[PDB]
Amino acid sequence: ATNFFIQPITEEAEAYYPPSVITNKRKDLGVDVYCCSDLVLQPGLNIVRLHIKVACEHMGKKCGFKIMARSSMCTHERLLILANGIGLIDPGYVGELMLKIINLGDTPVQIWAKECLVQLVAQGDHVPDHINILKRNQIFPL
Amino acid sequence: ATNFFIQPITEEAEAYYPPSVITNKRKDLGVDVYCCSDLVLQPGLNIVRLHIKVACEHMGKKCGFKIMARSSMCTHERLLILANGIGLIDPGYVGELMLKIINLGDTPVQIWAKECLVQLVAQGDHVPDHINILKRNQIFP
Amino acid sequence: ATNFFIQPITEEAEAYYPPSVITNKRKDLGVDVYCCSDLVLQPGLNIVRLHIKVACEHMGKKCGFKIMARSSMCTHERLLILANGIGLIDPGYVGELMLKIINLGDTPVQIWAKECLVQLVAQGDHVPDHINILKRNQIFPLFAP
Ligand SMILES: O=c1ccn([C@H]2C[C@H](O)[C@@H](COP(=O)(O)O)O2)c(=O)[nH]1
Ligand SMILES: O=c1ccn([C@H]2C[C@H](O)[C@@H](COP(=O)(O)O)O2)c(=O)[nH]1
Ligand SMILES: O=c1ccn([C@H]2C[C@H](O)[C@@H](COP(=O)(O)O)O2)c(=O)[nH]1
C-alpha cells in the first residue's frame, strides 16, 4: 500500500484541494499538484511555493518522494526547468513543498493558478493507491 | 524478472530495431534507444520522436519506466538537456515515446540517426533481464 | 540492507573523507558528497572530478545508484544544473565518479572544496543504513566490476 497525503496550507490552495480521497485506478506513477496562485516567473531562478504539506507512505511507514516536471511544464513559449533536475524529498521533511524553477528565456513568463507544472512520485516509483487531500484545519499526520 | 518490449513504428526505426531478444549480462540499468533519423535541433525547445512504442514488465505485470539522458547527450558543442529532467512513462501509456530537448546553445546542431541520446529505466530502477525487439507489422496486446 | 562504500582517491579528498562508518539515523535518501577541491566552472559544460570511488550494495549484492543535485547547487547568483538531469551509475562501473555540470550564466562561477553540490541515491531509492568511508591506500574488491 502506497499513499500520499496532501494538505493545503493557504486559502488559495484550499480552493484547489477540497478534502477528499482520490483513487488512482489509471495507475499513473505521478500525482499532479497545482500552482494554486498565478505566477510571473522572472528570467533565471525562481523559488516557487506549492502551498501544501505532503507526506508519502509505503507499507504503513512514512517514506520519501520525488518532484518531477510534467511534460507540459516546458513549452515553446516558456523554457522552464526544475533546477535540481528532480526534487528529492526525505521522509523526515515536514515543511511546505517548494520548487526551484529556472526560466531559461529572456522574458518573464505567466503561470496560471490551475496549472500543474510538476508531479509527485513515491520513493521507489510505487504507484499510489490513494491520494488523501486533508482539511486545512487538521493536525498534519505525524 | 524485468523485461522491456520495444516495437518500431516507422521504417526508419525498423533499420535500427531488427526483431531480436537482447540479454543484459553487463547488468546495466538503462536501455539505450536510437534517434532513428538525422535531426537538426534549433536553439530552444525541440520535439523529438523516438519512433518506438515501449512496454516494461516487472514480475509479470506491466509497469511504468523512466527516460533519462545518457552522459554523452550533452557535450561542449551540443549543450542539450531533457526539458523535463527525466521522462516519466506511466504503465497505461501505449503511444510513441517522445522527447522534449532544449538546445541551450546559440546555433542549430546536428543529431545523427545512430546516436542514443537517452536510455530507458524500469519503474523502481530494476535491472532488465531481456530487451525484446518486436516486429513492426504485428499487433501485440 | 542498503550500504554505500566511498573511497577517496586523492589527498585533497582524504581530508573530507577520513575513514569511518556513518549511520543514517535521519533515514535521509541521499548521501552528500564534497567537491574536495576548489573549482572554477566556466559558462557552459564542465566535467568535474568527485575524487572518490563509490560502491552501493543492496541485500549484500552490488547495485547501481544515482547522482542528484542538492537544492544547494543552484542559487540566484550561480545558475548550475546537472547536464544529465540525474547521473545513472551502473553496478559495472568502477572508475572515479564524475559530474557534468552546466553553468547557465555568462560568467565563471566558483565552487569551494567544502560544498556538497550533489547526493548519491541507491538504485530503487532505498534508504542507506550505513555509509562506509574507506581507507585511501588499500585496494578493495567491493569496487570490482
Ligand atoms: O525540490 C525540492 C527539493 C527539496 N525540498 C525539501 C525536501 C528536502 O528534504 C529538503 C532539503 O533539501 P536539500 O536542500 O538538502 O536539497 O528540502 C523541496 O521542498 N523541494
Ligand atoms: O519525456 C516524456 C514524458 C512523458 N511521455 C509520455 C508518457 C506519459 O505517460 C505521457 C504523459 O507524461 P506527463 O505529462 O505526465 O509527464 O506522455 C513521453 O513520451 N516522454
Ligand atoms: O553523472 C554521471 C553519469 C555517469 N557516470 C559514469 C557511470 C556510468 O556507468 C558511466 C556511463 O554513463 P552513460 O554514458 O551510460 O550515461 O559513466 C558518472 O561518472 N557520472
Residue numbers in the entry:
A (entry chain A): 2 to 143
B (entry chain C): 2 to 142
C (entry chain B): 2 to 146
Could you share sentences copied from the article?
Deoxyuridine 5'-triphosphate nucleotidohydrolase (dUTPase, EC 3.6.1.23) is a ubiquitous enzyme in DNA repair that plays a key role in preventing uracil from being incorporated into DNA. dUTPases are widespread in organisms, including eukaryotes, prokaryotes, and some viruses. On the one hand, it catalyzes the cleavage of dUTP into dUMP and pyrophosphate (PPi), which reduces the possibility that dUTP will be incorporated into DNA through DNA polymerase. Herein, we determine the crystal structures of ASFV dUTPase and swine dUTPase in both their ligand-free and ligand-bound forms. We observe that the swine enzyme employs a classical dUTPase architecture made up of three-subunit active sites, whereas the ASFV enzyme employs a novel two-subunit active site.
The aDUT-dUMP structure represents the postreaction state of the product dUMP bound to the active site. The crystal of the aDUT-dUMP complex grew in the P212121 space group with two trimers consisting of six subunits in each asymmetric unit. All of the subunits in the asymmetric unit have essentially identical structures, although the C terminus lacks clear electron density. In the aDUT-dUMP complex structure (postreaction state), (i) dUMP tightly bound to key amino acids in aDUT in the same manner as dUPNPP, Met99 was responsible for pairing with the uracil ring, and Tyr94 was responsible for the recognition and stabilization of deoxyribose; (ii) α-phosphates interact with Arg71 and Ser72; and (iii) the C terminus (motif V) returned to an open state, which is very conducive to product release. Comparison of the postreaction state and quiescent state showed an RMSD of 0.364 Å for the active sites, suggesting that the conformational changes are also beneficial to the release of the product. After the catalytic reaction, the C terminus (motif V) returns to an open state, and PPi at the entrance of the active site is expected to exit freely since it can easily interact with the solvent. The magnesium ion (charge 2+) might facilitate PPi discharge since it is more likely to bind PPi (charge −4) than dUMP (charge −2).
